[PDB]
Design an enzyme around this catalytic site. Structure first.
Site, PDB file in Angstrom:
ATOM      1  N   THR A 239       0.844  -1.188   0.000  1.00  0.00           N
ATOM      2  CA  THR A 239       0.000   0.000   0.000  1.00  0.00           C
ATOM      3  C   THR A 239       0.885   1.245   0.000  1.00  0.00           C
ATOM      4  O   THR A 239       0.593   2.207  -0.705  1.00  0.00           O
ATOM      5  CB  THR A 239      -0.932   0.011   1.225  1.00  0.00           C
ATOM      6  OG1 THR A 239      -1.686  -1.212   1.247  1.00  0.00           O
ATOM      7  CG2 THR A 239      -1.905   1.189   1.155  1.00  0.00           C
ATOM      8  N   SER A 282      -6.192   1.738   0.555  1.00  0.00           N
ATOM      9  CA  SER A 282      -6.714   0.641   1.379  1.00  0.00           C
ATOM     10  C   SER A 282      -8.181   1.002   1.562  1.00  0.00           C
ATOM     11  O   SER A 282      -8.529   1.784   2.449  1.00  0.00           O
ATOM     12  CB  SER A 282      -6.038   0.569   2.754  1.00  0.00           C
ATOM     13  OG  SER A 282      -6.704  -0.393   3.561  1.00  0.00           O
ATOM     14  N   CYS A 348      -4.918   2.316  11.734  1.00  0.00           N
ATOM     15  CA  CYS A 348      -3.569   1.884  11.380  1.00  0.00           C
ATOM     16  C   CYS A 348      -2.495   2.108  12.441  1.00  0.00           C
ATOM     17  O   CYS A 348      -2.219   3.239  12.835  1.00  0.00           O
ATOM     18  CB  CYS A 348      -3.121   2.533  10.065  1.00  0.00           C
ATOM     19  SG  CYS A 348      -1.522   1.904   9.493  1.00  0.00           S
TER      20      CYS A 348
HETATM   21  N1  LIG Z   1      -3.281 -18.528   1.684  1.00  0.00           N
HETATM   22  C1  LIG Z   1      -4.074 -17.896   0.817  1.00  0.00           C
HETATM   23  N2  LIG Z   1      -4.860 -18.610  -0.105  1.00  0.00           N
HETATM   24  C2  LIG Z   1      -5.691 -17.929  -1.011  1.00  0.00           C
HETATM   25  N3  LIG Z   1      -5.840 -16.601  -1.118  1.00  0.00           N
HETATM   26  C3  LIG Z   1      -5.057 -15.909  -0.200  1.00  0.00           C
HETATM   27  C4  LIG Z   1      -4.165 -16.464   0.779  1.00  0.00           C
HETATM   28  N4  LIG Z   1      -3.536 -15.498   1.534  1.00  0.00           N
HETATM   29  C5  LIG Z   1      -4.047 -14.382   1.012  1.00  0.00           C
HETATM   30  N5  LIG Z   1      -4.970 -14.544  -0.032  1.00  0.00           N
HETATM   31  C6  LIG Z   1      -5.759 -13.564  -0.860  1.00  0.00           C
HETATM   32  O1  LIG Z   1      -5.215 -12.264  -0.927  1.00  0.00           O
HETATM   33  C7  LIG Z   1      -5.712 -11.393   0.122  1.00  0.00           C
HETATM   34  C8  LIG Z   1      -4.568 -11.168   1.049  1.00  0.00           C
HETATM   35  O2  LIG Z   1      -4.979 -10.337   2.056  1.00  0.00           O
HETATM   36  P1  LIG Z   1      -5.166 -10.817   3.540  1.00  0.00           P
HETATM   37  O3  LIG Z   1      -3.921 -11.283   4.170  1.00  0.00           O
HETATM   38  O4  LIG Z   1      -6.433 -10.684   4.196  1.00  0.00           O
HETATM   39  O5  LIG Z   1      -4.855  -9.252   3.787  1.00  0.00           O
HETATM   40  P2  LIG Z   1      -3.572  -8.321   3.388  1.00  0.00           P
HETATM   41  O6  LIG Z   1      -2.186  -8.820   3.583  1.00  0.00           O
HETATM   42  O7  LIG Z   1      -3.855  -6.962   2.861  1.00  0.00           O
HETATM   43  O8  LIG Z   1      -3.576  -7.768   4.914  1.00  0.00           O
HETATM   44  C9  LIG Z   1      -3.360  -8.594   6.144  1.00  0.00           C
HETATM   45  C10 LIG Z   1      -4.261  -8.078   7.292  1.00  0.00           C
HETATM   46  O9  LIG Z   1      -3.994  -6.648   7.468  1.00  0.00           O
HETATM   47  C11 LIG Z   1      -5.207  -5.942   7.325  1.00  0.00           C
HETATM   48  N6  LIG Z   1      -4.992  -4.659   6.623  1.00  0.00           N
HETATM   49  C12 LIG Z   1      -5.819  -3.573   7.029  1.00  0.00           C
HETATM   50  C13 LIG Z   1      -5.555  -2.409   6.325  1.00  0.00           C
HETATM   51  C14 LIG Z   1      -4.575  -2.245   5.300  1.00  0.00           C
HETATM   52  C15 LIG Z   1      -3.791  -3.431   4.974  1.00  0.00           C
HETATM   53  C16 LIG Z   1      -2.748  -3.280   3.883  1.00  0.00           C
HETATM   54  O10 LIG Z   1      -2.022  -4.307   3.540  1.00  0.00           O
HETATM   55  O11 LIG Z   1      -2.556  -2.128   3.329  1.00  0.00           O
HETATM   56  C17 LIG Z   1      -3.992  -4.643   5.627  1.00  0.00           C
HETATM   57  C18 LIG Z   1      -6.125  -6.820   6.519  1.00  0.00           C
HETATM   58  O12 LIG Z   1      -7.527  -6.520   6.626  1.00  0.00           O
HETATM   59  C19 LIG Z   1      -5.780  -8.198   7.048  1.00  0.00           C
HETATM   60  O13 LIG Z   1      -6.531  -8.577   8.223  1.00  0.00           O
HETATM   61  C20 LIG Z   1      -6.974 -12.120   0.682  1.00  0.00           C
HETATM   62  O14 LIG Z   1      -8.156 -11.333   0.820  1.00  0.00           O
HETATM   63  C21 LIG Z   1      -7.102 -13.368  -0.225  1.00  0.00           C
HETATM   64  O15 LIG Z   1      -8.122 -13.157  -1.235  1.00  0.00           O
HETATM   65  C1  HEM Z   2       0.075   4.494   3.377  1.00  0.00           C
HETATM   66  C2  HEM Z   2      -0.037   3.155   3.602  1.00  0.00           C
HETATM   67  C3  HEM Z   2      -1.060   2.526   4.627  1.00  0.00           C
HETATM   68  C4  HEM Z   2      -2.409   2.833   4.550  1.00  0.00           C
HETATM   69  C5  HEM Z   2      -3.333   3.653   3.737  1.00  0.00           C
HETATM   70  C6  HEM Z   2      -2.905   2.009   5.685  1.00  0.00           C
HETATM   71  C7  HEM Z   2      -4.315   1.927   6.104  1.00  0.00           C
HETATM   72  C8  HEM Z   2      -4.814   1.148   7.164  1.00  0.00           C
HETATM   73  C9  HEM Z   2      -6.316   1.153   7.483  1.00  0.00           C
HETATM   74  C10 HEM Z   2      -7.397   1.912   6.796  1.00  0.00           C
HETATM   75  C11 HEM Z   2      -6.354   0.271   8.553  1.00  0.00           C
HETATM   76  C12 HEM Z   2      -7.682  -0.095   9.301  1.00  0.00           C
HETATM   77  C13 HEM Z   2      -8.247  -1.529   8.941  1.00  0.00           C
HETATM   78  C14 HEM Z   2      -9.513  -1.802   9.710  1.00  0.00           C
HETATM   79  O1  HEM Z   2      -9.965  -0.902  10.489  1.00  0.00           O
HETATM   80  O2  HEM Z   2     -10.069  -2.905   9.561  1.00  0.00           O
HETATM   81  C15 HEM Z   2      -5.082  -0.173   8.786  1.00  0.00           C
HETATM   82  C16 HEM Z   2      -4.726  -1.186   9.843  1.00  0.00           C
HETATM   83  C17 HEM Z   2      -3.502  -1.666  10.073  1.00  0.00           C
HETATM   84  N1  HEM Z   2      -2.271  -1.308   9.404  1.00  0.00           N
HETATM   85 FE1  HEM Z   2      -2.119   0.034   7.928  1.00  0.00          FE
HETATM   86  N2  HEM Z   2      -1.916   1.294   6.338  1.00  0.00           N
HETATM   87  C18 HEM Z   2      -0.833   1.609   5.706  1.00  0.00           C
HETATM   88  C19 HEM Z   2       0.514   1.164   5.934  1.00  0.00           C
HETATM   89  C20 HEM Z   2       0.787   0.188   7.015  1.00  0.00           C
HETATM   90  C21 HEM Z   2       2.123  -0.333   7.287  1.00  0.00           C
HETATM   91  C22 HEM Z   2       3.399   0.116   6.486  1.00  0.00           C
HETATM   92  C23 HEM Z   2       2.048  -1.248   8.320  1.00  0.00           C
HETATM   93  C24 HEM Z   2       3.092  -2.028   8.929  1.00  0.00           C
HETATM   94  C25 HEM Z   2       3.628  -1.910  10.076  1.00  0.00           C
HETATM   95  C26 HEM Z   2       0.570  -1.179   8.598  1.00  0.00           C
HETATM   96  C27 HEM Z   2       0.006  -1.991   9.600  1.00  0.00           C
HETATM   97  C28 HEM Z   2      -1.297  -2.070   9.987  1.00  0.00           C
HETATM   98  C29 HEM Z   2      -1.801  -2.974  11.051  1.00  0.00           C
HETATM   99  C30 HEM Z   2      -1.087  -3.952  11.901  1.00  0.00           C
HETATM  100  C31 HEM Z   2      -3.168  -2.742  11.128  1.00  0.00           C
HETATM  101  C32 HEM Z   2      -4.187  -3.314  11.958  1.00  0.00           C
HETATM  102  C33 HEM Z   2      -4.154  -2.492  13.343  1.00  0.00           C
HETATM  103  C34 HEM Z   2      -5.178  -3.003  14.321  1.00  0.00           C
HETATM  104  O3  HEM Z   2      -6.073  -3.849  14.019  1.00  0.00           O
HETATM  105  O4  HEM Z   2      -5.167  -2.606  15.465  1.00  0.00           O
HETATM  106  N3  HEM Z   2      -0.242  -0.331   7.864  1.00  0.00           N
HETATM  107  N4  HEM Z   2      -4.076   0.367   7.944  1.00  0.00           N
END
Ligand SMILES: Nc1ncnc2c1ncn2[C@@H]1O[C@H](COP(=O)(O)OP(=O)(O)OC[C@H]2O[C@@H]([n+]3cccc(C(=O)O)c3)[C@H](O)[C@@H]2O)[C@@H](O)[C@H]1O
Ligand code: HEM
Length: 399
Positions: A239, A282, A348
């Site tokens: 992201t 995101s 975040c």
């Molecule tokens: N083992 C597997 N087998 C099949 N498909 C798989 C997979 N692992 C991931 N995927 C696919 O790809 C996606 C990978 O994402 P998944 O690990 O949930 O999510 P992703 O790595 O983005 O993020 C990991 C956790 O961080 C949270 N999060 C919140 C806000 C921002 C961000 C961010 O990265 O900027 C992340 C997110 O909601 C999740 O609980 C899944 O929705 C799934 O469709």
């Molecule tokens: C500019 C880039 C990023 C954007 C826009 C972003 C946005 C967000 C948003 C919107 C959430 C809330 C998800 C929810 O409420 O379900 C979130 C959660 C989170 N982000 Fe990011 N994020 C960014 C970069 C990162 C990075 C670099 C890390 C790594 C350390 C990170 C780690 C996390 C973690 C661990 C959570 C979950 C926190 C919790 O559940 O308490 N994010 N992020």
């Protein structure tokens, strides 16, 4: 009910559907890939409510959770970490790694963020672009956040290509279930080795603190440490890469604002604020389920039904941000918080870190390369698939 997620209207734009919904059907049902119906929340006030209501749960395997694709079901099998928890479990584990991300900690990290950006830019300068443009993503947008989190976690820089590749396969919608599963496991196996190394010989990094402060004392087990490291490695890195690339494309699209930034790099913070609102990289992560019947807007959401709160739509809410669809770093900000990084308990953990990386990038980039230009027509930028979060795959540039 319309199929969801919606596809972006065009490369840099959000789905066209959100505007109509906010105006006449703010809280509505959408049809997910498996035929299930979930609630889509589009107004800023409602998204904030969803993010803060004690009646909603973050637990991913909880009955009714709104997975958006078949792959989601498989990802959800991962050992739960704080991103999948509600109080008091949530903060109990999040507090274990929060110290690294506080405003104070991030401020002390500034010199390192600056050095990391400075060094990557210098290499671009030395490599030059006499023989043609270079990919700003591969040479800059990618290594900036990657190198920083790797240093914080305790990951070796040499593994950038491998780790980036594996997560890409894991999350790529074109990956077969098998391919994605194998990739996820390669990531866990890799981190397991690292965690084992720190249990034997700790260093001053996140993984090591988890080992000495939580694993050895028996507060969490080895597998928990691995999962937490996995979460911090994969969440947000891609992201950040996209946000950096999108920032450069946005400035090329808004020449007047780039001119202002070049004249005064101290405007980087306000540029970053508008960037985080305008390009919500995101937009599908704020998902929950109701623990009990509860009112969201004027709709009654029943126990165990899924909800998707679009912070992207909230960031384009015309009743909050004036002329929301126009990028303007000079806008006068309202009392309502932009929601690029979420809201509430799960806001975040790296918000301060991310904004510092972005502020450093945009206060330095054009000072280093005042003539930086995107080397392809803006209409031809290689954006991510419209059915996914907004981002840029590669961005050819000259300077
Ligand atoms: N083992 C597997 N087998 C099949 N498909 C798989 C997979 N692992 C991931 N995927 C696919 O790809 C996606 C990978 O994402 P998944 O690990 O949930 O999510 P992703 O790595 O983005 O993020 C990991 C956790 O961080 C949270 N999060 C919140 C806000 C921002 C961000 C961010 O990265 O900027 C992340 C997110 O909601 C999740 O609980 C899944 O929705 C799934 O469709
Ligand atoms: C500019 C880039 C990023 C954007 C826009 C972003 C946005 C967000 C948003 C919107 C959430 C809330 C998800 C929810 O409420 O379900 C979130 C959660 C989170 N982000 Fe990011 N994020 C960014 C970069 C990162 C990075 C670099 C890390 C790594 C350390 C990170 C780690 C996390 C973690 C661990 C959570 C979950 C926190 C919790 O559940 O308490 N994010 N992020």
């Amino acid at each position: 009910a319309p199929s969801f997620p919606f596809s972006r209207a065009s490369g840099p734009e959000p789905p066209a559907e959100f505007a109509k919904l906010r105006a006449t059907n703010p809280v509505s049902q959408v049809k997910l890939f498996d035929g299930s119906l979930a609630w889509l929340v589009t107004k800023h006030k409602d998204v904030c409510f969803v993010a803060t209501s004690e009646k909603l749960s973050k637990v991913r395997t909880r009955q009714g959770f709104p997975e958006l694709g078949a792959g989601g079901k498989q990802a959800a099998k991962a050992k739960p970490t704080f991103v999948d928890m509600d109080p008091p479990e949530h903060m109990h584990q999040r507090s274990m790694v929060e110290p690294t991300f506080t405003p104070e900690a991030v401020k002390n990290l500034q010199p390192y963020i600056q050095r990391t950006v400075d060094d990557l830019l210098e290499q671009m300068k030395q490599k030059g672009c006499a023989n043609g443009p270079v990919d700003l993503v591969k040479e800059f947008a990618l290594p900036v956040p990657s190198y920083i989190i790797y240093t914080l976690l305790g990951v070796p820089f040499n593994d950038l290509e491998y780790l980036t590749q594996q997560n890409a396969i894991r999350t790529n919608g074109s990956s077969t279930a098998r391919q994605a599963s194998a990739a996820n496991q390669e990531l866990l196996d890799y981190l397991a080795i690292l965690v084992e190394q720190r249990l034997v010989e700790p260093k001053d990094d996140i993984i090591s603190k988890l080992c000495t402060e939580q694993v050895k004392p028996g507060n969490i087990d080895k597998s928990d440490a691995v999962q937490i490291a996995f979460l911090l490695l994969v969440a947000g890195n891609a992201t950040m890469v996209n946000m950096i690339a999108l920032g450069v494309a946005t400035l090329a699209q808004h020449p007047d604002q780039l001119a202002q930034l070049k004249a005064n790099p101290s405007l980087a913070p306000q540029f970053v604020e508008e960037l985080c609102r305008y390009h919500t990289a995101s937009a599908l992560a704020i998902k929950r389920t109701a623990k009990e019947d509860v009112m969201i807007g004027d709709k009654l959401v029943r126990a165990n039904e899924g909800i998707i709160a679009s912070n992207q739509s909230a960031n384009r809410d015309e009743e909050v941000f004036e002329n929301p669809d126009e990028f303007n770093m000079n806008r006068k900000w309202p009392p309502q918080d932009p929601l690029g990084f979420g809201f509430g308990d799960h806001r975040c953990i790296a918000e301060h870190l991310a904004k510092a990386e972005l502020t450093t990038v945009f206060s330095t980039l054009y000072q280093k390369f005042p003539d930086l230009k995107v080397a392809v027509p803006l209409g031809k930028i290689n954006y991510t698939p419209l059915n996914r979060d907004v981002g840029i795959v590669d961005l050819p540039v000259i300077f």
